Design an enzyme around this catalytic site. Structure first.
Site, PDB file in Angstrom:
ATOM      1  N   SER D 131       0.818  -1.257   0.285  1.00  0.00           N
ATOM      2  CA  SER D 131       0.118   0.199   0.101  1.00  0.00           C
ATOM      3  C   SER D 131       0.601   1.409  -0.405  1.00  0.00           C
ATOM      4  CB  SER D 131      -1.020  -0.268   1.243  1.00  0.00           C
ATOM      5  OG  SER D 131      -0.360  -0.384   2.362  1.00  0.00           O
ATOM      6  N   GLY D 135       3.442   2.226   6.251  1.00  0.00           N
ATOM      7  CA  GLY D 135       4.855   2.514   6.632  1.00  0.00           C
ATOM      8  C   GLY D 135       6.037   1.569   6.436  1.00  0.00           C
ATOM      9  N   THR D 136       5.027   0.338   6.076  1.00  0.00           N
ATOM     10  CA  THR D 136       5.536  -0.899   5.893  1.00  0.00           C
ATOM     11  C   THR D 136       6.042  -0.862   4.680  1.00  0.00           C
ATOM     12  OG1 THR D 136       5.275  -2.060   8.204  1.00  0.00           O
ATOM     13  CG2 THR D 136       6.329  -3.770   6.040  1.00  0.00           C
ATOM     14  N   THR D 170      -7.588   7.186   5.834  1.00  0.00           N
ATOM     15  CA  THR D 170      -8.074   6.403   7.627  1.00  0.00           C
ATOM     16  C   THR D 170      -6.639   6.496   8.186  1.00  0.00           C
ATOM     17  OG1 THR D 170      -6.382   3.842   6.572  1.00  0.00           O
ATOM     18  CG2 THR D 170      -9.247   3.582   6.494  1.00  0.00           C
ATOM     19  N   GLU D 245       4.021 -10.534 -19.981  1.00  0.00           N
ATOM     20  CA  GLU D 245       3.811  -9.246 -21.532  1.00  0.00           C
ATOM     21  C   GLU D 245       3.703  -8.080 -21.095  1.00  0.00           C
ATOM     22  OE1 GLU D 245       2.614  -8.907 -25.433  1.00  0.00           O
ATOM     23  OE2 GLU D 245       3.641 -10.318 -25.101  1.00  0.00           O
TER      24      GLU D 245
HETATM   25  N1  GTP Z   1      -8.647  -2.737  -0.237  1.00  0.00           N
HETATM   26  C1  GTP Z   1      -8.336  -3.367   0.900  1.00  0.00           C
HETATM   27  N2  GTP Z   1      -7.647  -2.347   1.782  1.00  0.00           N
HETATM   28  C2  GTP Z   1      -6.743  -2.276   2.549  1.00  0.00           C
HETATM   29  C3  GTP Z   1      -6.299  -3.506   3.449  1.00  0.00           C
HETATM   30  N3  GTP Z   1      -5.793  -3.381   4.784  1.00  0.00           N
HETATM   31  C4  GTP Z   1      -5.237  -2.378   4.469  1.00  0.00           C
HETATM   32  N4  GTP Z   1      -5.574  -1.257   3.516  1.00  0.00           N
HETATM   33  C5  GTP Z   1      -5.234  -0.428   3.474  1.00  0.00           C
HETATM   34  O1  GTP Z   1      -4.240  -0.660   3.298  1.00  0.00           O
HETATM   35  C6  GTP Z   1      -3.549   0.797   4.475  1.00  0.00           C
HETATM   36  C7  GTP Z   1      -2.737   0.215   5.539  1.00  0.00           C
HETATM   37  O2  GTP Z   1      -1.574   1.025   6.084  1.00  0.00           O
HETATM   38  P1  GTP Z   1      -1.013   0.572   7.255  1.00  0.00           P
HETATM   39  O3  GTP Z   1      -2.459   0.087   8.602  1.00  0.00           O
HETATM   40  O4  GTP Z   1      -0.539   1.641   8.445  1.00  0.00           O
HETATM   41  O5  GTP Z   1      -0.721  -1.032   7.238  1.00  0.00           O
HETATM   42  P2  GTP Z   1       1.010  -0.914   6.572  1.00  0.00           P
HETATM   43  O6  GTP Z   1       0.309  -0.425   5.502  1.00  0.00           O
HETATM   44  O7  GTP Z   1       1.432  -2.422   6.781  1.00  0.00           O
HETATM   45  O8  GTP Z   1       1.682   0.247   7.452  1.00  0.00           O
HETATM   46  P3  GTP Z   1       2.022   0.097   8.703  1.00  0.00           P
HETATM   47  O9  GTP Z   1       0.941  -0.259   9.757  1.00  0.00           O
HETATM   48  O10 GTP Z   1       3.548   0.799   9.389  1.00  0.00           O
HETATM   49  O11 GTP Z   1       3.365  -1.807   8.689  1.00  0.00           O
HETATM   50  C8  GTP Z   1      -4.445   1.515   5.001  1.00  0.00           C
HETATM   51  O12 GTP Z   1      -4.653   2.716   4.811  1.00  0.00           O
HETATM   52  C9  GTP Z   1      -5.540   1.071   4.450  1.00  0.00           C
HETATM   53  O13 GTP Z   1      -6.503   2.062   3.765  1.00  0.00           O
HETATM   54  C10 GTP Z   1      -7.849  -4.314   2.555  1.00  0.00           C
HETATM   55  O14 GTP Z   1      -7.773  -6.064   3.100  1.00  0.00           O
HETATM   56  N5  GTP Z   1      -8.310  -4.199   1.734  1.00  0.00           N
HETATM   57 MG    MG Z   2       0.811  -2.537  10.116  1.00  0.00          MG
END
Ligand code: GTP
Ligand code: MG
Ligand code: GTP
Ligand code: GDP
Ligand code: GDP
Ligand code: MG
EC number: 3.6.5.-
Lengths: 142, 58, 426, 430, 439, 427
Positions: D131, D135-136, D170, D245
Site C-alpha cells: 500500500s 509504513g511497511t 484512514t 507481456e
Molecule cells: N482494499 C483494502 N485495503 C486495505 C486492506 N488492508 C489495508 N488496506 C489499506 O492499506 C493501508 C494499510 O496501512 P497501515 O494500516 O499503516 O498498514 P501497513 O501498510 O502495513 O503500514 P504499517 O502499519 O506501518 O506496517 C490502509 O490505509 C488501508 O486503506 C485490505 O484488506 N483491503
Molecule cells: Mg501495520
C-alpha cells in the site's frame, strides 16, 4: 443503375462463368451448332497478329479466297443470338445487384450500433441511489 | 439450440446432431470444439477417396 | 516426388500447424496413433513427401515446432493429433519473448536458433531430394515474428536454391491484437522480401467474414479458421502427392506467378465453401467453383483485388473435370473484365488439374493470386508505424536490447519502396 | 514450468494475499491442508509427501496480522519460514520502514527470495503487494523493489499497490509516505496495477447490492482481479498472455507505468440470472466510469494502451466484433500515436466461486487494465495535498529523526512535478 | 429444356405455393424430402422434371421457385413444415416486418431493402436454367406486401429480362365478402404498375371458388387449403404441355399470341371442368361434350362476373388424359350453335385447343375425384370489365372524404398517385368498352 | 421477431400487468421460477415477443415497472409470478402522488420520468426490431394518469416510428372511487389524443355487469376483474406469436382500424363467457361467437353502440375454424345491422385467423371496435369537469406544483373539439 452505390471501380467484375456454360447446354440438344462458349479467332479483327496481316502479298490472297471484308453464321449468332443477348442483359451490373455480393472485406464491421445500467454507469433506480450515487461524494464535473 | 427463431435459426436446428455438447459442468461450444468443429467442409466426412485416375479409366 | 520440411513458430504457428497436420493425416488416412487405416493405394504411394517412415508400419513427422514458451508444447502434445509428433522435434526455451521483436530476433531468439538448426540439419540430411520449407507464423508477435524471420535467414544461408514458403497471419485492419504489432510487422516484412520465394498473407478478419456469411455458423473457434487456412495449405501441394493430368509443384507455380523477385505476396482462397445446412443442395460443377473462386469475399487477406488489378492468377484444381471447361472458365474470367488484369503480358491464369479430390468432396479448387491491391496492407502498416515512430513510443523495449534506431528506418524505407513499386504496375 | 513468486508486504499485502491464495487453492484441487484428493507448477511446489507448498512470501513488521494466519486452517499450507514478522511496527512513518527498522529485515527477505528462486527453473515474474500510504508498504516495499533490481536485473517486477483514495483516507500522514514511495521506485519498477478502496466501496454498494462491506469483502474482488491476471500462466487458452507481456505491451515510456484495473461482471447471485451476460455487454462493462477500481474519470484524459483478458465462454469472433464496437462511440478517446490501442487475451477456464462470497457463478469474465492520461488528476490531487501540509513542515520532525534528512521531501516533490509535466506532454496530439 | 420459374409473393402467394408445389412433387416421382424413391428408376431420356425441378449432383431435385414475404410468420411455417428439406434455404427470402395493408411501405420503404436480395436470388436461379421462357407471379391484389412489393418486383424484372413473358395469378377482391377495410386502395394502385409491365394477367377471386366448393363438391365450410388446390390444378394444366407429350403441344408463347388481341387486353377468365367429388362422379356419366359445356356455364367461373352480358373474344382450351380430337371438335361445333353464348364480330373462329397425354393426378386427402380428362379454359372476355365497375365504386366512396390516406402520405408516398390510378382504371374500362362495339 | 415492450404505471396498471404476466406465462408454459415447462414446440418459437433470454435458458419478461410509491410493487413481487420479473426493472420513489395529475407530471413524475427512459432505452435497443409499446394504467389515478402521459410524451419524442398501445381504465358512470377524477382524467386524455396510436377504454362497471349476468359469479373480486381484460389484451397480439391463415400485427390492427389519427379510441370485448352451469346448453360454433361478439352485454366499456355508429371493426379469431363461415358471419352482421354502420366505408369488419386456441378452449376471439358512440364517455367527463370548474372545487391542489388555468381551458378545448369531430362523423 447505381442504387447499390459502392466505390465505382466495384460493380464491374462481371463474374459469371456459369452463364456461359448453361447456354452452351442449349446447343447440346440442338443439331445446328451456332453459339459456343469459345469465340472464333478471326486474325483480321484480332489485335495481336496484325504484323503478318498488314504486310505485302496479303491482299492478293484475301480477295480471291472470299475473305476480304471456321464459320460465318456462327458470327451472326455470336453477336446477335439470344444467348449473347441474355448474357449482355445480365452483365450491365458487373457484380450483383445486392450489397452482400458487391462487398469484399472492407464492409465487414461498418454499421456497428454501440449499446451501453445507466449511460456512463451510476444506476439510480433506487431513490437512495438517485439522491446520491455515492455515500462519499462525486468529483469533477460531467 | 434453435427453439426461438431470432438470428440464424435454420442452420443449427439442422446441425444439432453435429454440435451436441454431451454433458459436463459449464460445457459450452468453446472448450468443446476448440480444436475444430465437425463437418465444416464436407458433410460426409468418412467416404473413401476415389481410386480412379485418368489413365486407369480411359 | 520432392519432400517438404514443415516449420512452426510461435503459438499461432503451432496452433495452425496442429490443424494442418490433422487434415493432412485424414487426407492420407493416418490415425492419431500414427499407423495406416486408409482404403486406397494412392494414399501410400507418395506419403514420403510429408511423412518419414518408421518401423512397425507407422509414419513419423517431418515437422519442427518452435516456441519460447513451454506452455504451448503441452497444448499441442495433448491435442487430438498430439501423440504422432516426434519427441526430439519439440525445441523450446524457458522464458518468453513478450511480443517483442527485439528479443525475438537478437537477445532470446539467438541461443535457441542453434538447436532448431541442429534439428533441421539432422532431419533434412535424410532426404533423397528436398524441394523446400514451409513456415506458419504471425507477424504481430514475438516468437513467430522475431525468430520466424531469423530462421528463414539461416536456412537461406544454408540451402539457397530450395523453395522457402510462408503462410503468415498478417496484422488485422480494424482491431489489433498488440500495440507494438506495427513495429513487429514492419520489422518482419523487411526480412521477408529478400528471403522468401513465396509468401501468403492470411488475415483473421477475412476468415471471420467467411465464417459469418459463407459458412453461416454463429460460434466459430480458432479451429475453424485454422481448418479454412489449412484447406489451402494442402491445396498447393496436391500434385506432389496425387497424380493428375496437369501437375504443378510449388516451384512451377512460383515461376509462373511472380515476374520480379520483390512481389511475392499472395491472397489465398478456397472454392467449395458453403454452410452445412445448405451443403447437400449445391451442385458442384467447375463453373460453380469458378463463380466464387474469383469472388473477393472469398479471400483470406483483408484487401480487395477488385480495387487494384491482377498481376497473375493461379488455380490448382482437384477432381474429375473436363480439360476444355477449365480453360473455358479461366479464359472467360480473363476476357470479360479486361480492366482487372495487367496488359503487358498476354495471359495471367495458370492451369493445374489434379483428379484425386478431398474426402467426401467431388471437386475442389485452390487460389493463389498476386495483385497490386495488396499494397494497401503495407500502406496502413507503414502509416501506423510512422505514427508510432515520430513520438518514439514503445522504443526502449527495442533499443535497450542491443539494437540501433536506424534499423527501424531502413525497414520503413524497404517497405515504402515495396509500396511505391507496386504502383508502377497499376 | 512458468513459475512466478509473490511478495506480500504490509497489512494490505497479507490481507490481500489471504484472499488471493484462498482463491488459488479453490480453483486448483488444493485443500487448505495442502494435499489433493492445467499448468499447475506456476504457483505451487511439490514435495515428498504429496504436499503442494505455495511460493509466496508474507512480510510485515508487526506480528498481529501474520500470527492469525499461523494459527488458522492454512497453518500447514504456507511454509513456516516464508512468513516474516518483525517485533514492532513502522508506525505510519516512511523513514522508519526505510532506514531504521527496514534496514536489517532485508537480509532475511532476500535470503528467502533467493531460496525460492533456486527451486524455480522457469522464473519469469515478480508480484509485489503493498500500500502506498503505510509504513511497511511505503518504506520496506520500496527498499525491496530498489534491491531486487540490482540482485535480479531484468526480471519482470509488476506491483499491485493501493493508491490512497481521492476523498477518504484512514490515516493522515498518508500523502507523505505516498509521495516518498513513488519517487524512490519510478526507476525501479515495470508496471503498477493500481486500485482505490473508495471505488471498490462504490462498486460493492451499487453493483453488488450489499451494504456495509468489510475489508475481506473488498479483498475477495481484489484477489479475483489477480486470479485473472495470472490465469494465462496457469490454464491453457487460445491466446496466452504471460507476466512479461504486460510491460512490453502496456507502458510506452519507462517513467509512466501506472494503469488502472477493472473487473467487468460484478453482480450478486440474485441478479445474475435475470440478465444477458453476452460478450457485447461485458466488454462494454469495462468502459463506463462507474466500474473502475480507481475513482478517476477517463472522460477527461485519453487512453494510451489497454489489455483485456477474457475467461470462460470466449469464442474469439465476438471479442473482435465487440472491441470494434468501442471505436464507433466518440465519448471514448485515444491518443493519436497509438492507432491500434488494444490487446486481446483469451483463456478457457471460467471463474470460480468462493463459499460466502457475494459474487455469482458466471461463464464470462473480463479483467481489463489500461493506462490513461486521466491519472494525472490523481497525481495533481496528491500534489496539492503534499504542498498544503509541507508548506509549514507539519509532520516533518518525525521523519528527520529516523535516519533521514530534509532534502528527500523536496526531491520527491520535484520528481512528481516532472512526472506531471511528462503526463501533460503525452496528452498532446501534435 | 423448357424451364419455367415461379415467384410467390406475400402470405397468399406462399400459401398458394404450399398447395401447388405438393401437386408438382406428385406429378413426378418426387418425395417430400426432394429425392427419388430409388425403386421407380426413370429412363435417362425423359426430362419431365426439368421444367419445374433442377437436378443436382447426387440425386436431389431442388425446385425453381422463390418464396418471398416481408413477414417471417408464414414462410417459417414452410421450413418447419412437412417440406422443409425440399426447398433451398436461400430460396425462402423473408424480411423483418410487414407492410400492414399499406402500398406505401411495401413499395417505397419496407420493400426496397430486400428487393436487391430477391433480384440476386432470381438471377442466381436463372443462371442454371437454359430455355427460360416464362415467369409465374403468385401474389394478392388486396394485400400490402403482395400489392406493393410484387409491383416493385415486376417493375424491376422487366429492366433485367426485357421481352420475357410475365404471367401472373393474383387474388382479386370479392364484391360481397372481403378481409380488410383498405384493400380498395391497394387494389387500385396495383392496376397502374402491372397493367403495362405484364403480358397476361389471370385473376382469381376467393368467393367465386367458395360457391364452386359448395355446389360442385360437397365440401361444406372449406378452408383456404381446399381453395389453393384448385389454383394448383389450373396452373398445372396451363404448364402441362411443357413437360408431357401430347397430340397438340402448346408452348408458352402460343398462349399469349392468340389470347391477347390488343396490348391492353390481357385479363381473361379461368375455369376448370371436372370439379366433382367421388360420390357425384360415380353416378355421373358425363363426357367430353359437357366438360366442354360445363366450363361455359356462369356458375363454374372463378371470377364473379356473368359471361351472359359480355362478348367472348378469344377462348383457349387445354385437354388432358385420353382425348381424341373428334369429340373435341364436335363439342366445339355444338358451342357454335348455341344462341345464348355470344361472340364478337371480328373473331371468326376464336378457339385454341391443346391435347395432352396425361390424366390429372390426385393428392393424399383432398376431395377431387380422379378423372381421366380435364378442361382448363382461359376465356378472354369483355364481361370482366364489370368486375372493375365495382372496385372503382369501392374507391371513390372513401376517396371523397380522404379516409386512410394519412397512412399512405407519411411513408414515402405523395397523394398524386390515387388521382392517376383512378384515371388509369377509367381508361382501362374504356378500352374494354371499345372492343365490344359492333362495326 | 416483432418485439414489444410492456410498461405499467401506478397501482391499477401494476395489478393489471401482474394478472397479464400470470396468464401469458401460463400460456407459453413459463414456470414461476422462469423455466419453460410445456408440451408443444410451438410455444417456444415466438416467445421473444414478450420475453427475453438469460444465462441458462431462463425467460425474463420485457416489462418495465414504475410508480411513485412502492406500496404496490412489493405486493406483486412476492405474489405468484413475482420472481420472474427483472429486479432492476422495478423503479420507484419515496413519496407517492395520491390522486393528483399535477405532481406525477410536473414535480414528482418529472424526476422519475428519466428513470423509465433509462430502462426503456436499455430494453429497447437490445432487441432486433420493436413493433410497439404497451402501457396499462388508469386515468383516475395520480401516478398512472399523470406519469403515464409524461412517459408517452417522452417516448414518442424519441421513437416516432413505433406504435403506442395504451389500455386506459376509464372511470365508470355510476361509480366514483376518486372524487378528483374529472381533472386527472381530462388532463390524461388531453395528452393521450396526440401521442398514442390506439387506446383501449376499459370500464369497471361493464366488468361487474359481465360477472353479474354473463358469468353468473357470486363473489366477483378484483382478480376476476383483471383476468377478464387480461384475456382480451393478450388476445389482441395473438397473430404475432402463433401461425395463422390470416395474420395481423399491431400495425395491421392500426392501418385497418383508424381512418383519421384523432379517431383512435377503441372499445374491446371477448366472446366465450358463459357460466360453468350453462356451458353445454349451447354449441361452440362460429355463429354463437359472432352473435355474442356484437351483443350489448359483452364489451368492457360502459357505452352503448345503439346511439352511435361503427367506423371500422376488427376481430381476431383464434383456433381451428373455417374461413367462409367467418365471411358469412361478418357480412350478414353488416347486412341486417346496416343502420348501425357507416355507409361511406364499404366493409367495416377486419378479420384475422390464428390456429392455436387458448389453453382450455376450442375457439375464441377478441373484439376491437372504433365507434362514434364512444363520445358518450367524454360527454360525461366534460360535464363533470365543467361542474367542478365554476366553483374551482379542488383547483388549489393543482396550482401548487407549477400549473395554470389556461392548461385546464385548453384541455377542455381539446375535448369539445374531439367530441365535435366524432359527432360530425356520426352522421
Ligand atoms: N482494499 C483494502 N485495503 C486495505 C486492506 N488492508 C489495508 N488496506 C489499506 O492499506 C493501508 C494499510 O496501512 P497501515 O494500516 O499503516 O498498514 P501497513 O501498510 O502495513 O503500514 P504499517 O502499519 O506501518 O506496517 C490502509 O490505509 C488501508 O486503506 C485490505 O484488506 N483491503
Ligand atoms: Mg501495520
Ligand atoms: N385463395 C387464397 N387467398 C388467400 C390465401 N391467403 C391469403 N389470401 C387472401 O389474401 C388477402 C390478403 O392477404 P395478404 O396478401 O397476406 O395481405 P398482406 O397485406 O400482404 O398481409 P401480410 O402478408 O401479412 O403483409 C386476403 O384477403 C385473403 O383473401 C390463400 O391461401 N388462398
Ligand atoms: N488464424 C489463427 N490465428 C491465430 C491462431 N492462434 C493465434 N493466432 C493469431 O496470432 C496473433 C498473436 O500471435 P502471438 O500470440 O503474438 O504469437 P507468439 O509470437 O507466439 O507470441 C493473434 O492476432 C491471433 O489472431 C490460430 O489458431 N489461428
Ligand atoms: N380493474 C381494476 N381496476 C383497478 C385496479 N386497481 C385500481 N383500479 C382502478 O384505478 C382507479 C383509481 O386509480 P388509482 O388507484 O388512484 O391509481 P394510482 O394513482 O396508482 O393510485 C379506479 O378507477 C379503479 O377502478 C385493479 O386491480 N383492477
Ligand atoms: Mg402476411
Amino acid at each position: 443503375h447505381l442504387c447499390a452505390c459502392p466505390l465505382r471501380r466495384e460493380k464491374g467484375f462481371i463474374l459469371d462463368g456459369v452463364a456461359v456454360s448453361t447456354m452452351a447446354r442449349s446447343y447440346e440438344h440442338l443439331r445446328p451448332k451456332l453459339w459456343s462458349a469459345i469465340p472464333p479467332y478471326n486474325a483480321q479483327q484480332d489485335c495481336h497478329s496484325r504484323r503478318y496481316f498488314r504486310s505485302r502479298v496479303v491482299p492478293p490472297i484475301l480477295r480471291e479466297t472470299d475473305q476480304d471484308h471456321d464459320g460465318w453464321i456462327v458470327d451472326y449468332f455470336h453477336i446477335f443470338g439470344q444467348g449473347q443477348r441474355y448474357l449482355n442483359r445480365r452483365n450491365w451490373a458487373g457484380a450483383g445487384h445486392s450489397l452482400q455480393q458487391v462487398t469484399g472485406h472492407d464492409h465487414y464491421n461498418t454499421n456497428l450500433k454501440a449499446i451501453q445500467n445507466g449511460r456512463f454507469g451510476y444506476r439510480r433506480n433506487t431513490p437512495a441511489l438517485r439522491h446520491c450515487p455515492s455515500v462519499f461524494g462525486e468529483i469533477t464535473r460531467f | 439450440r434453435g427453439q426461438c427463431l431470432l438470428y440464424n435459426w435454420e442452420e443449427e436446428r439442422a446441425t444439432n446432431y453435429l454440435d451436441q455438447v454431451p454433458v459436463m459442468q459449464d460445457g459450452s461450444e468453446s472448450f468443446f470444439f476448440r480444436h475444430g468443429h465437425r463437418g465444416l467442409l464436407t458433410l460426409q466426412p468418412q467416404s473413401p477417396t476415389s481410386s480412379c485416375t485418368t489413365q486407369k479409366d480411359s | 516426388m520432392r519432400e517438404i520440411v514443415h516449420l512452426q513458430a510461435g503459438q499461432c504457428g503451432n496452433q495452425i500447424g496442429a490443424k494442418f497436420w490433422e487434415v493432412i493425416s485424414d487426407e492420407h488416412g493416418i490415425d492419431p496413433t500414427g499407423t495406416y487405416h486408409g482404403d486406397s493405394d494412392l494414399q501410400l504411394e507418395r506419403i514420403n513427401v510429408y511423412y518419414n517412415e518408421a518401423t512397425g508400419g507407422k509414419y513419423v513427422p517431418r515437422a519442427v515446432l518452435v516456441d519460447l514458451e513451454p506452455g504451448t508444447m503441452d497444448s499441442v502434445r495433448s491435442g487430438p493429433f498430439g501423440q504422432i509428433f516426434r519427441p526430439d522435434n519439440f525445441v523450446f526455451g524457458q522464458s518468453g519473448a513478450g511480443n517483442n521483436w527485439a528479443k525475438g530476433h537478437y537477445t532470446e531468439g539467438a541461443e535457441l536458433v542453434d538447436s532448431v538448426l541442429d534439428v533441421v540439419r539432422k532431419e533434412a540430411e535424410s532426404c533423397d531430394c528436398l524441394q523446400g520449407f514451409q513456415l506458419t507464423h504471425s507477424l504481430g508477435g514475438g516468437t513467430g515474428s522475431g525468430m520466424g524471420t531469423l530462421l528463414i535467414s539461416k536456412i537461406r544461408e544454408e540451402y539457397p536454391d530450395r523453395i522457402m514458403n510462408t503462410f503468415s497471419v498478417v496484422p488485422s485492419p480494424k482491431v489489433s491484437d498488440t500495440v507494438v504489432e506495427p513495429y513487429n510487422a514492419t520489422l518482419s516484412v523487411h526480412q521477408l522480401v529478400e528471403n522468401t520465394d513465396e509468401t501468403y498473407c492470411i488475415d483473421n478478419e477475412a476468415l471471420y467474414d467467411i465464417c459469418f456469411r459463407t459458412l453461416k455458423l454463429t460460434t466459430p473457434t480458432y479451429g475453424d479458421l485454422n481448418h479454412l487456412v489449412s484447406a489451402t495449405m494442402s491445396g498447393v501441394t496436391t500434385c506432389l502427392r496425387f497424380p493428375g493430368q496437369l501437375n504443378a509443384d510449388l516451384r512451377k507455380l512460383a515461376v509462373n506467378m511472380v515476374p520480379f523477385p520483390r512481389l511475392h505476396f499472395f491472397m489465398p482462397g478456397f472454392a467449395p465453401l458453403t454452410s452445412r445446412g445448405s451443403q447437400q443442395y449445391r451442385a458442384l460443377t467447375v463453373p460453380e467453383l469458378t463463380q466464387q473462386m474469383f469472388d473477393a469475399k472469398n479471400m483470406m487477406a483483408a484487401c480487395d483485388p477488385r480495387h487494384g488489378r491482377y498481376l497473375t492468377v493461379a488455380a490448382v484444381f482437384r477432381g474429375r473435370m473436363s480439360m476444355k471447361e477449365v480453360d473455358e472458365q479461366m479464359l472467360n474470367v480473363q476476357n470479360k473484365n479486361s480492366s482487372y488484369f495487367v496488359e503487358w503480358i498476354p495471359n495471367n491464369v495458370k492451369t493445374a488439374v489434379c483428379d484425386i479430390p478431398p474426402r467426401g468432396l467431388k471437386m475442389s479448387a485452390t487460389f493463389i493470386g498476386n495483385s497490386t491491391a495488396i499494397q494497401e496492407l503495407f500502406k496502413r502498416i507503414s502509416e501506423q508505424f510512422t505514427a508510432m515512430f515520430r513520438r518514439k513510443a514503445f522504443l526502449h523495449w527495442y533499443t535497450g536490447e542491443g539494437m540501433d534506431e536506424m534499423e527501424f528506418t531502413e525497414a520503413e524505407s524497404n517497405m515504402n519502396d515495396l509500396v511505391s513499386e507496386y504502383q508502377q504496375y497499376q | 514450468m512458468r513459475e512466478c513468486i509473490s511478495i506480500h508486504v504490509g497489512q494490505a499485502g497479507v490481507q490481500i494475499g489471504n484472499a488471493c491464495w484462498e482463491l488459488y487453492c479453490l480453483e486448483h484441487g488444493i485443500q487448505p491442508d495442502g494435499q489433493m484428493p492445467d499448468s499447475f507448477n506456476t504457483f505451487f511446489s511439490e514435495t515428498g509427501a504429496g504436499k503442494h507448498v505455495p511460493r509466496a512470501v508474507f512480510v510485515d513488521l508487526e506480528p498481529t496480522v501474520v500470527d492469525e494466519v499461523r494459527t488458522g486452517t492454512y497453518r500447514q499450507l504456507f511454509h513456516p519460514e516464508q512468513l516474516i514478522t518483525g517485533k514492532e511496527d513502522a508506525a505510519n512513518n516512511y523513514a522508519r520502514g526505510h532506514y531504521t527498522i527496514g534496514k536489517e529485515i532485508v537480509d532475511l527477505v532476500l535470503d528467502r527470495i533467493r531460496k525460492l528462486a533456486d527451486l524455480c527453473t522457469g522464473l519469469q515474474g515478480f508480484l509485489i503487494f503493498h500500500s502506498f500510504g503505510g509504513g511497511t508498504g511505503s518504506g520496506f516495499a520500496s527498499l525491496l523493489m530498489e534491491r531486487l533490481s540490482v540482485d535480479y536485473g531484468k526480471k519482470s517486477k509488476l506491483e499491485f499497490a493501493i493508491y490512497p483514495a481521492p476523498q477518504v483516507s484512514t490515516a493522515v500522514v498518508e500523502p507523505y509516505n505516498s509521495i516518498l514511495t513513488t519517487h524512490t521506485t519510478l526507476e525501479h519498477s515495470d508496471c503498477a496495477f493500481m486500485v482505490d478502496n473508495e471505488a471498490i466501496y462504490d462498486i460493492c454498494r451499487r453493483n453488488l447490492d450489499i451494504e456495509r462491506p468489510t475489508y475481506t469483502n473488498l479483498n475477495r474482488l481484489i484477489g479475483q482481479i489477480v486470479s485473472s491476471i495470472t490465469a494465462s500462466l496457469r490454464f491453457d487458452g487460445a491466446l496466452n498472455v504471460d507476466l512479461t507481456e504486460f510491460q512490453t505491451n502496456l507502458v510506452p515510456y519507462p517513467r509512466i507505468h501506472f494503469p488502472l484495473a477493472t473487473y467487468a461482471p460484478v453482480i450478486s447471485a440474485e441478479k445474475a440470472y435475470h440478465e444477458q451476460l453476452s460478450v457485447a455487454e461485458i466488454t462494454n462493462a469495462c468502459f463506463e466510469p462507474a466500474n473502475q477500481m480507481v475513482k478517476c474519470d477517463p472522460r477527461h484524459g485519453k487512453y494510451m494502451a489497454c489489455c483485456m483478458l477474457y475467461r470462460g465462454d470466449v469464442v474469439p469472433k465476438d471479442v473482435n466484433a465487440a472491441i470494434a464496437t468501442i471505436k464507433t462511440k466518440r465519448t471514448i478517446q485515444f491518443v493519436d500515436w497509438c492507432p491500434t490501442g488494444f490487446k486481446v487475451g483469451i483463456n478457457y477456464q471460467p471463474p470460480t466461486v468462493v463459499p460466502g462470497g457475494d459474487l455469482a457463478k458466471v461463464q464470462r469474465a473480463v479483467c481489463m487494465l489500461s493506462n490513461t492520461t486521466a491519472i494525472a488528476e490523481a497525481w495533481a490531487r496528491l500534489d496539492h495535498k503534499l504542498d498544503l501540509m509541507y508548506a509549514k513542515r507539519a509532520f516533518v520532525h518525525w521523519y528527520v529523526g529516523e535516519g533521514m534528512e530534509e532534502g528527500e521531501f523536496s526531491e520527491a516533490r520535484e520528481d512528481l512535478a516532472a512526472l506531471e509535466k511528462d503526463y501533460e506532454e503525452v496528452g498532446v496530439d501534435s
